[PDB]
Design a protein around this motif. Sequence first.
Motif, PDB file in Angstrom:
ATOM      1  N   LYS A   8       0.820  -1.228   0.000  1.00 14.18           N
ATOM      2  CA  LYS A   8       0.000   0.000   0.000  1.00 14.18           C
ATOM      3  C   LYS A   8       0.855   1.281   0.000  1.00 14.18           C
ATOM      4  CE  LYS A   8      -4.227   2.278   1.641  1.00 14.18           C
ATOM      5  NZ  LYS A   8      -5.295   2.098   2.696  1.00 14.18           N
ATOM      6  N   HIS A  15      -0.347   5.173  -7.567  1.00 13.98           N
ATOM      7  CA  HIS A  15      -1.811   5.021  -7.680  1.00 13.98           C
ATOM      8  C   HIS A  15      -2.440   6.313  -8.060  1.00 13.98           C
ATOM      9  CE1 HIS A  15      -6.071   4.522  -6.706  1.00 13.98           C
ATOM     10  NE2 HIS A  15      -5.862   3.260  -6.924  1.00 13.98           N
ATOM     11  N   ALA A  18      -1.903   7.021 -11.592  1.00 14.45           N
ATOM     12  CA  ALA A  18      -2.651   6.123 -12.452  1.00 14.45           C
ATOM     13  C   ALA A  18      -4.122   6.534 -12.492  1.00 14.45           C
ATOM     14  CB  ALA A  18      -2.544   4.673 -11.982  1.00 14.45           C
ATOM     15  N   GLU A  19      -4.683   6.835 -11.342  1.00 15.07           N
ATOM     16  CA  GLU A  19      -6.133   7.163 -11.301  1.00 15.07           C
ATOM     17  C   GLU A  19      -6.383   8.481 -11.969  1.00 15.07           C
ATOM     18  OE1 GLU A  19      -5.733   7.757  -6.503  1.00 15.07           O
ATOM     19  OE2 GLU A  19      -7.877   7.696  -7.415  1.00 15.07           O
ATOM     20  N   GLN A  28     -13.677   8.702 -15.909  1.00 15.75           N
ATOM     21  CA  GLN A  28     -14.398   9.027 -14.645  1.00 15.75           C
ATOM     22  C   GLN A  28     -15.388  10.118 -14.830  1.00 15.75           C
ATOM     23  OE1 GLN A  28     -10.468   8.842 -12.624  1.00 15.75           O
ATOM     24  NE2 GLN A  28     -11.701   8.765 -10.768  1.00 15.75           N
ATOM     25  N   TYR A 124      -1.808  -8.607  -7.141  1.00 17.22           N
ATOM     26  CA  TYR A 124      -2.203  -7.523  -6.224  1.00 17.22           C
ATOM     27  C   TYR A 124      -2.661  -6.301  -7.030  1.00 17.22           C
ATOM     28  CZ  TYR A 124      -1.240  -3.302  -3.423  1.00 17.22           C
ATOM     29  OH  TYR A 124      -1.247  -2.047  -2.826  1.00 17.22           O
ATOM     30  N   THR A 125      -1.772  -5.853  -7.951  1.00 16.32           N
ATOM     31  CA  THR A 125      -1.982  -4.620  -8.674  1.00 16.32           C
ATOM     32  C   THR A 125      -3.279  -4.648  -9.490  1.00 16.32           C
ATOM     33  OG1 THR A 125       0.363  -4.066  -8.750  1.00 16.32           O
ATOM     34  CG2 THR A 125      -1.048  -3.051 -10.502  1.00 16.32           C
ATOM     35  N   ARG A 126      -3.527  -5.752 -10.185  1.00 10.98           N
ATOM     36  CA  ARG A 126      -4.761  -5.830 -10.973  1.00 10.98           C
ATOM     37  C   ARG A 126      -6.001  -6.203 -10.105  1.00 10.98           C
ATOM     38  NH1 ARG A 126      -5.747  -2.617 -14.698  1.00 10.98           N
ATOM     39  NH2 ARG A 126      -7.640  -3.677 -14.272  1.00 10.98           N
ATOM     40  N   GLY A 129      -7.353  -3.665  -7.406  1.00  6.55           N
ATOM     41  CA  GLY A 129      -7.923  -2.508  -8.059  1.00  6.55           C
ATOM     42  C   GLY A 129      -9.287  -2.821  -8.696  1.00  6.55           C
ATOM     43  N   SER A 132     -11.850  -2.374  -6.301  1.00  4.38           N
ATOM     44  CA  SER A 132     -11.911  -1.050  -5.721  1.00  4.38           C
ATOM     45  C   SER A 132     -12.385  -0.074  -6.759  1.00  4.38           C
ATOM     46  CB  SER A 132     -10.507  -0.735  -5.171  1.00  4.38           C
ATOM     47  OG  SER A 132     -10.021  -1.748  -4.253  1.00  4.38           O
ATOM     48  N   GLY A 133     -11.432   0.609  -7.364  1.00  2.00           N
ATOM     49  CA  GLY A 133     -11.785   1.558  -8.468  1.00  2.00           C
ATOM     50  C   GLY A 133     -12.504   0.941  -9.644  1.00  2.00           C
ATOM     51  N   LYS A 169     -11.071  -8.226   0.054  1.00  2.49           N
ATOM     52  CA  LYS A 169      -9.778  -7.568   0.029  1.00  2.49           C
ATOM     53  C   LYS A 169      -9.043  -7.667   1.370  1.00  2.49           C
ATOM     54  CE  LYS A 169     -11.639  -3.722  -1.684  1.00  2.49           C
ATOM     55  NZ  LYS A 169     -11.637  -2.227  -1.931  1.00  2.49           N
ATOM     56  N   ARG A 173      -5.405  -9.325   1.705  1.00  3.73           N
ATOM     57  CA  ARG A 173      -4.261  -8.651   2.348  1.00  3.73           C
ATOM     58  C   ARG A 173      -3.645  -9.496   3.471  1.00  3.73           C
ATOM     59  NH1 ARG A 173      -8.062  -4.216   2.178  1.00  3.73           N
ATOM     60  NH2 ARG A 173      -7.565  -2.882   0.392  1.00  3.73           N
ATOM     61  N   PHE A 197       2.084  -0.953 -11.845  1.00  4.99           N
ATOM     62  CA  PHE A 197       1.374   0.287 -12.023  1.00  4.99           C
ATOM     63  C   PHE A 197       1.845   1.046 -13.258  1.00  4.99           C
ATOM     64  CE2 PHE A 197      -1.784   1.388  -8.842  1.00  4.99           C
ATOM     65  CZ  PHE A 197      -1.635   0.461  -7.832  1.00  4.99           C
ATOM     66  N   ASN A 200       0.487  -0.296 -16.468  1.00  6.43           N
ATOM     67  CA  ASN A 200      -0.867   0.137 -16.679  1.00  6.43           C
ATOM     68  C   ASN A 200      -0.959   1.575 -17.191  1.00  6.43           C
ATOM     69  OD1 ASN A 200      -3.167  -1.899 -15.727  1.00  6.43           O
ATOM     70  ND2 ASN A 200      -1.349  -2.211 -14.411  1.00  6.43           N
ATOM     71  N   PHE A 204      -2.587   2.976 -20.633  1.00  5.87           N
ATOM     72  CA  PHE A 204      -3.606   4.063 -20.749  1.00  5.87           C
ATOM     73  C   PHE A 204      -3.147   5.214 -21.555  1.00  5.87           C
ATOM     74  CE2 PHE A 204      -4.848   2.680 -16.305  1.00  5.87           C
ATOM     75  CZ  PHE A 204      -5.495   1.557 -16.803  1.00  5.87           C
TER      76      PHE A 204
END
Length: 213
Positions: A8, A15, A18-19, A28, A124-126, A129, A132-133, A169, A173, A197, A200, A204
């Motif tokens: 984390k 993160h 990326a977001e 979004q 974890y990374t994929r 997420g 979550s997002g 999740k 963890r 990350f 990714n 994008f």
Amino acid sequence: QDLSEALKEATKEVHIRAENSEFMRNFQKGQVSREGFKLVMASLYHIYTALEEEIERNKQNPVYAPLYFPEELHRRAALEQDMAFWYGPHWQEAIPYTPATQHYVKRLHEVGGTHPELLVAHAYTRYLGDLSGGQVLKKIAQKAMALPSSGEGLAFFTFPSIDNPTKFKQLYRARMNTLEMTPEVKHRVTEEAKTAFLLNIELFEELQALLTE
Ligand code: HEM
């Protein structure tokens, strides 16, 4: 420091970056079109296919096995159903395989074949997420593109074997914290998650450029 916390902490900055990729900002805001969404989901098809091949290869290896959750997490079959939805019955020969997608696949196969102690970073990374997002994106996608609540075209975002993503999740963890861990593995797993990350982010950026070209 527990692995889940180390990851984390290691990935919280990237993160944010990326977001806030332009493709994700536009997504979004609700500016995602069939063209763009097809390009991304096709790319994910190739990415999760590679990831889950490598998970299968390493399912009994103890450096990964505690995170072996095919029924709950694996996405390839969902993506196949989405590809048939978006690209039709001959989707296998219609779908694109972009260079940035190839680069991500390549690293997945390197990790799974040569550095399987790092595979946890890519899972974890994929997956986390997606829980979550990805759940926020799924709702935006439905609204923007008029996709039905019955789920067609968004199988990727749907986890029928997980009742509660928050609870899953937490379990994931905690399970990560049971892997055998040394300072070398911990350092390198966190590094590989930052790489994941970036792969990714690069995807994008590429897809945004393809759509703007
Ligand atoms: C618009 C895009 C995105 C939004 C709105 C978003 C949102 C979130 C939110 C609110 C959380 C916290 C969940 C929790 O504490 O249980 C989260 C966690 C996560 N996200 Fe994203 N995210 C986005 C894109 C990404 C991308 C591109 C990736 C990676 C490819 C990613 C990977 C993760 C991971 C691995 C976690 C778990 C962090 C941890 O608990 O250690 N997310 N995201």
